[PDB]
Design an enzyme around this catalytic site. Structure first.
Site, PDB file in Angstrom:
ATOM      1  N   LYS A   1       4.138   0.036   8.313  1.00  0.00           N
ATOM      2  CA  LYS A   1       3.956   1.286   7.428  1.00  0.00           C
ATOM      3  C   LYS A   1       5.229   2.164   7.723  1.00  0.00           C
ATOM      4  CE  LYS A   1       0.506   4.651   8.279  1.00  0.00           C
ATOM      5  NZ  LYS A   1      -1.126   5.103   8.038  1.00  0.00           N
TER       6      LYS A   1
ATOM      7  N   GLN B   1       4.309   4.755   2.800  1.00  0.00           N
ATOM      8  CA  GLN B   1       4.171   3.245   2.400  1.00  0.00           C
ATOM      9  C   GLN B   1       3.773   2.377   3.348  1.00  0.00           C
ATOM     10  OE1 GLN B   1       7.195   3.528  -1.534  1.00  0.00           O
ATOM     11  NE2 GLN B   1       7.794   4.338   0.255  1.00  0.00           N
TER      12      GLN B   1
ATOM     13  N   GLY C   1       0.838  -1.222   0.079  1.00  0.00           N
ATOM     14  CA  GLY C   1       0.099   0.118   0.210  1.00  0.00           C
ATOM     15  C   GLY C   1       1.118   1.485   0.160  1.00  0.00           C
ATOM     16  N   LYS C   2       0.319   2.356  -0.538  1.00  0.00           N
ATOM     17  CA  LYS C   2       0.939   3.652  -0.279  1.00  0.00           C
ATOM     18  C   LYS C   2      -0.248   4.777  -0.232  1.00  0.00           C
ATOM     19  CE  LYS C   2       2.937   5.764  -3.919  1.00  0.00           C
ATOM     20  NZ  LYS C   2       4.356   5.485  -3.843  1.00  0.00           N
ATOM     21  N   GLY C   3       0.385   5.881   0.410  1.00  0.00           N
ATOM     22  CA  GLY C   3      -0.527   7.070   0.554  1.00  0.00           C
ATOM     23  C   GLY C   3       0.182   8.038   0.654  1.00  0.00           C
ATOM     24  N   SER C   4      -0.390   9.531   1.020  1.00  0.00           N
ATOM     25  CA  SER C   4       0.221  10.742   1.520  1.00  0.00           C
ATOM     26  C   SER C   4       1.032  10.498   2.588  1.00  0.00           C
ATOM     27  CB  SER C   4      -0.872  11.751   1.644  1.00  0.00           C
ATOM     28  OG  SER C   4      -1.629  11.748   0.383  1.00  0.00           O
TER      29      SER C   4
ATOM     30  N   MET D   1       0.134  -8.689  10.356  1.00  0.00           N
ATOM     31  CA  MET D   1      -0.369  -9.033   8.947  1.00  0.00           C
ATOM     32  C   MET D   1      -1.939  -9.521   8.779  1.00  0.00           C
ATOM     33  SD  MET D   1       0.567  -8.906   5.782  1.00  0.00           S
ATOM     34  CE  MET D   1       2.082  -9.058   5.608  1.00  0.00           C
ATOM     35  N   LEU D   2      -2.708  -8.369   8.427  1.00  0.00           N
ATOM     36  CA  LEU D   2      -4.347  -8.727   8.063  1.00  0.00           C
ATOM     37  C   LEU D   2      -4.412  -9.365   6.759  1.00  0.00           C
ATOM     38  CD1 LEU D   2      -5.704  -5.684  10.108  1.00  0.00           C
ATOM     39  CD2 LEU D   2      -5.325  -8.133  11.019  1.00  0.00           C
TER      40      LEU D   2
ATOM     41  N   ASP E   1     -13.030   8.293  10.620  1.00  0.00           N
ATOM     42  CA  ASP E   1     -13.087   7.911   9.136  1.00  0.00           C
ATOM     43  C   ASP E   1     -13.372   6.455   8.717  1.00  0.00           C
ATOM     44  OD1 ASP E   1     -12.731   8.648   6.291  1.00  0.00           O
ATOM     45  OD2 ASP E   1     -10.566   8.213   6.470  1.00  0.00           O
TER      46      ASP E   1
HETATM   47  O1  LIG Z   1      -2.578   3.583   6.365  1.00  0.00           O
HETATM   48  C1  LIG Z   1      -3.773   3.447   6.120  1.00  0.00           C
HETATM   49  N1  LIG Z   1      -4.555   4.276   5.637  1.00  0.00           N
HETATM   50  C2  LIG Z   1      -3.963   5.216   4.780  1.00  0.00           C
HETATM   51  C3  LIG Z   1      -5.036   6.561   4.315  1.00  0.00           C
HETATM   52  N2  LIG Z   1      -5.253   7.282   5.668  1.00  0.00           N
HETATM   53  C4  LIG Z   1      -6.127   8.313   5.403  1.00  0.00           C
HETATM   54  C5  LIG Z   1      -6.770   9.138   6.778  1.00  0.00           C
HETATM   55  O2  LIG Z   1      -5.395   9.097   7.666  1.00  0.00           O
HETATM   56  C6  LIG Z   1      -4.339   9.403   6.694  1.00  0.00           C
HETATM   57  C7  LIG Z   1      -4.122   7.954   6.272  1.00  0.00           C
HETATM   58  N3  LIG Z   1      -4.537   2.594   7.012  1.00  0.00           N
HETATM   59  C8  LIG Z   1      -3.797   1.732   7.765  1.00  0.00           C
HETATM   60  C9  LIG Z   1      -3.247   2.114   8.919  1.00  0.00           C
HETATM   61  C10 LIG Z   1      -2.513   1.219   9.731  1.00  0.00           C
HETATM   62  C11 LIG Z   1      -2.383  -0.049   9.317  1.00  0.00           C
HETATM   63  C12 LIG Z   1      -2.728  -0.721   8.244  1.00  0.00           C
HETATM   64  C13 LIG Z   1      -2.747  -2.012   7.745  1.00  0.00           C
HETATM   65  C14 LIG Z   1      -2.521  -2.957   8.577  1.00  0.00           C
HETATM   66  C15 LIG Z   1      -2.449  -4.425   7.963  1.00  0.00           C
HETATM   67  C16 LIG Z   1      -2.793  -4.431   6.628  1.00  0.00           C
HETATM   68  N4  LIG Z   1      -2.516  -5.565   5.891  1.00  0.00           N
HETATM   69  C17 LIG Z   1      -2.642  -5.259   4.456  1.00  0.00           C
HETATM   70  N5  LIG Z   1      -2.747  -6.140   3.497  1.00  0.00           N
HETATM   71  C18 LIG Z   1      -2.581  -7.508   3.603  1.00  0.00           C
HETATM   72  O3  LIG Z   1      -2.182  -7.864   4.486  1.00  0.00           O
HETATM   73  C19 LIG Z   1      -2.361  -8.195   2.439  1.00  0.00           C
HETATM   74  C20 LIG Z   1      -2.676  -7.634   1.119  1.00  0.00           C
HETATM   75  C21 LIG Z   1      -3.971  -8.167   1.847  1.00  0.00           C
HETATM   76  S1  LIG Z   1      -2.956  -3.649   4.593  1.00  0.00           S
HETATM   77  C22 LIG Z   1      -2.879  -3.297   5.802  1.00  0.00           C
HETATM   78  N6  LIG Z   1      -2.821  -2.123   6.315  1.00  0.00           N
HETATM   79  C23 LIG Z   1      -3.629   0.291   7.363  1.00  0.00           C
END
Ligand SMILES: O=C(NCCN1CCOCC1)Nc1cccc(-c2ccc3nc(NC(=O)C4CC4)sc3n2)c1
Length: 342
Positions: free
Chosen positions: A55, A39, A33-36, A107-108, A154
């Site tokens: 993260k 990563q 994943g990535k965002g503002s 890890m989800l 959110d």
């Molecule tokens: O960072 C996130 N969203 C970014 C956008 N936000 C919008 C508003 O606030 C600013 C950031 N969400 C987030 C925050 C903390 C942990 C996680 C997280 C935890 C486990 C995880 N596991 C993921 N994917 C997997 O394990 C496999 C591919 C399916 S993605 C993921 N993301 C996600």
């Protein structure tokens, strides 16, 4: 020319290379994943012998400080939920690596938006929807703990992940938008589709906004499509009015932003401004859910646990989550005692 001795790009992001090992511990597999903020990578922890989601926050003060705000809230929630049964994502570690704050999560699996995409936005069953609803309601009760009093701010399908791709258990992620109940500092909050009416109206808000968001989410999980898909705030409020009617007068008389959407007539009553839309309260939830027509689009006709009686229980719980009044809107504790969960 060169940023952070070559480790960063021009945009403050660590350049992720597959196969690196940070601190003789985390083996970096791939970008997930990535965002503002930065990563998210998939990495194998060699010490604990488990996969983790890491993260990597940007090498930038503004994103670093917002990340530490979230760390405090995550660590505060871990003290109140060892054993991990209230459905909040587990932050297990953080460290600094090459001037980046790294947050190590469990890890989800896939998020509920991906799941909806996988059904081609045609929804999931009332049975799976109920299981998500119970877990989410339980999770909101835990945030409602007096010593926490945390507004997620959110909730949406992309911020709810399955633990395991073959189980129905879920966790809530992204507390970067989150704060604890306090004095009002912020007004442009929540993602538009799940924004609550008090926030649209520019009025005081509390933990009830997350219940509004949950109402919207659950109908979307069953239908596949968002309930209120506003392209702007005026469109958003008009779509709420199609379903739920004009908000009550005692609310609109308080609302600073009422005149963005409504007009106070000379006799003191409120109606819509002209901008299209069905008349107020004529797009009934009863028909969106398909209570008597075999569910959304007739696709649940004859499926177990999709009778009319089951649908009226779902409808009733949702209308209690979509109460215009946040004081009388249903709270986590009583949502859990609703007939929908027996
Ligand atoms: O960072 C996130 N969203 C970014 C956008 N936000 C919008 C508003 O606030 C600013 C950031 N969400 C987030 C925050 C903390 C942990 C996680 C997280 C935890 C486990 C995880 N596991 C993921 N994917 C997997 O394990 C496999 C591919 C399916 S993605 C993921 N993301 C996600």
């Amino acid at each position: 020319k060169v940023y952070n001795d070559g480790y960063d790009d021009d945009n403050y992001d660590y350049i992720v290379k597959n196969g690196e090992k940070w601190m003789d511990r985390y083996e970096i597999d791939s970008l997930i994943g990535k965002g503002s903020f930065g990563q998210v990578v998939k990495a194998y922890d060699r010490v604990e012998q488990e996969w983790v989601a890491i993260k990597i926050i940007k090498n930038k003060k503004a994103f670093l400080n917002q990340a530490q705000i979230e760390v405090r809230l995550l660590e505060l929630m871990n003290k109140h939920d060892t054993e991990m049964k209230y459905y909040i994502v587990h932050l297990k570690r953080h460290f600094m690596f090459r001037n980046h704050l790294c947050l190590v999560f469990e890890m989800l699996s896939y998020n509920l938006y991906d799941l909806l995409r996988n059904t081609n936005f045609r929804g999931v069953s009332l049975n799976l929807t109920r299981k998500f609803a119970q877990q989410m309601c339980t999770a909101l009760l835990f945030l409602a703990t007096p010593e926490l009093s945390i507004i997620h701010c959110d909730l949406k399908p992309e911020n709810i992940l399955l633990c395991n791709p073959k189980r129905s258990a879920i966790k809530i992620v992204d507390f970067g938008s989150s704060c604890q109940l306090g004095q009002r500092i912020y007004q442009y909050i929540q993602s538009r589709f799940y924004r609550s009416p008090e926030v649209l109206l520019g009025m005081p808000y509390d933990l009830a906004i997350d219940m509004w968001s949950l109402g919207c989410i659950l109908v979307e999980m069953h239908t596949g499509e968002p309930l209120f898909s506003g392209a702007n705030e005026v469109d958003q409020m008009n779509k709420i009015v199609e379903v739920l009617g004009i908000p009550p007068a005692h609310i609109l008389d308080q609302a600073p932003k009422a005149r963005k959407f409504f007009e106070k007539l000379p006799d003191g009553t409120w109606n819509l401004k002209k901008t299209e839309y069905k008349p107020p309260g004529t797009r009934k939830l009863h028909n969106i859910l398909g209570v008597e027509t075999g569910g959304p689009g007739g696709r649940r006709a004859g499926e177990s646990g999709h009778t009319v009686a089951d649908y009226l229980k779902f409808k009733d719980l949702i209308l209690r989550m979509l109460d215009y009044d946040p004081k009388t809107r249903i709270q986590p504790y009583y949502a859990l005692q609703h007939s929908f969960f027996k």
